[PDB]
Amino acid sequence: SMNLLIMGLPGAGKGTQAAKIVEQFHVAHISTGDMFRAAMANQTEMGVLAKSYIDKGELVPDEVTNGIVKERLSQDDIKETGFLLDGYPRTIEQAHALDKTLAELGIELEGIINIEVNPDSLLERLSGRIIHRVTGETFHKVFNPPVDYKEEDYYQREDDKPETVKRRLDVNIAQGEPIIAHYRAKGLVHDIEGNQDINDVFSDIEKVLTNLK
C-alpha cells in the first residue's frame, strides 16, 4: 500500500501512467471524475449536492468538492490498498483542504508523481487534432498526419484550437504551480521526465515508487 498523488499538465500522459501504476502497484486510482461519479452513484450527502449544481451547468463549490474527497478517502479500500489521487487538488486551497482531510483520517501522503513536459511542446501536441472537411476522418498534426497534408483540407473542434488550448494550459500552470511548490517544500514531489516513450516514463516512475519505502 502507498498513498500517492499524480500531477501533470493536460497531455502529459497522466492517464496512461496512472493505469500502469495501478496494474503494477494495485493502488486505487481516483480521478476527480471518479470521485464525483461515485458520490452521485452512491447518493451520498455531497453527491446529491454536486448533482444539483451539475444538473444546472454550474461549477461545484469547494465545500462540496472537498467533502466528496473526504467521503472517498473514508472508504474501506483506502487504508487497504492505498491510492493515486489524480486531478484533485486543483488549487492550493484544495490542497490545504486535502491536507486537513488526510490529517483528520490519520493518513500520511507518501509521494507525488509529477510528470513534467514543456508547456510550449504540449501546446503543439494538444492543438494537433484535425478533421477532414469532406465527410470522414480524424487525424493529428503530430501523431498521425494525413496523406500529403495541407491545412485547408481540415478543420478543428473548438477545444482543439491553439487559442483554446493555450487558455487551458495557462489555467493549469497558474493553479498547479503553487500546489507543486507546497508539496515540494516537504520533499514529496518526484519530477518525472514526461519527455520519453510510455515505457521509459514508467520505468522512471517505478524507480521512484519501489524506492519510497
Each domain of the chain, given as residue ranges in start order, spans 1-213
Q: How far apart are the first and last CA of the chain?
A: 10
CB 155 within 8 A of CB 141: no
66: left (phi over 0), alpha (psi -120 to 50) or beta: alpha
Asked whether 4 and 83 are in contact (CB, 8 A), the reply is: yes
Residue 158 vs residues 17, 130, 164, 208: alpha-carbon distances, Å: 27, 11, 7, 38
Note if the bond before 89 is cis, omega within 30 degrees: yes
The CA distances from residue 127 to 71, 115, 150, 200, in Å, are: 36, 19, 16, 24
* Single-letter amino acid, residue 128: G
Cα radius of gyration rounded to whole Å, the chain: 19
Feature table: binding site for AMP: 32, 37, 58-60, 87-90, 94, 157, 168
Most distant CA atoms of the chain, gap in Å: 59
Whole-angstrom distance, CA of residue 136 vs CA of residue 202:
35
**How far apart, in whole angstroms, are the C-alpha atoms of residue 201 and residue 81?**
23
CB burial readout 54-63, b (16+ within 10 A) else e: eeeeeebeee
Q: Which fold has domain 1-213?
A: Rossmann fold (3.40.50)
**Strand, helix or coil at 4?**
strand
Sheet architecture: strand order including 189-193? 28-31, 82-86, 2-8, 111-116, 189-193
Given the C-alpha cell 511542446, which residue does it identify? 121
Instruction: State the Cα–Cα distance between residues 129 and 198, nearest whole angstrom.
Output: 20
- Return binding residues for ATP: 11-16, 129, 138-139, 196
Q: Which residue numbers belong to the known binding site? A: 11-16, 32, 37, 58-60, 87-90, 94, 129, 138-139, 157, 168, 196
The residues annotated with a catalytic role in the active site are 14, 90, 129, 157, 168
How far is residue 91's CA from residue 173's CA, in Å, rounded to a whole number? 10
CB atoms closer than 10 angstroms to residue 18: 24
Resolution of this deposited model, Å: 1.7
Say if residues 1 and 27 touch (Cβ distance below 8 Å).
yes
Distance set, CA 163 to CA 50, 166, 167, 168 (Å): 30, 5, 6, 9
Q: At what angle do helices 92-105 and 62-73 cross, to 10 degrees?
A: 30
Are the C-beta atoms of residues 9 and 89 closer than 8 Å to each other? no
Cell numbers standing for residue 104: 483528520
Nearest partner of 190 among 98, 129, 114, judged by Cα: 114
Name beta bridge partners: 99. none
Query: Can you tell me the distance from the alpha carbon of 149 to that of 57, in angstroms, rounded to the nearest whole number?
Result: 38
Closest listed residue to residue 95, CA positions, set 76, 109, 110, 113: 109
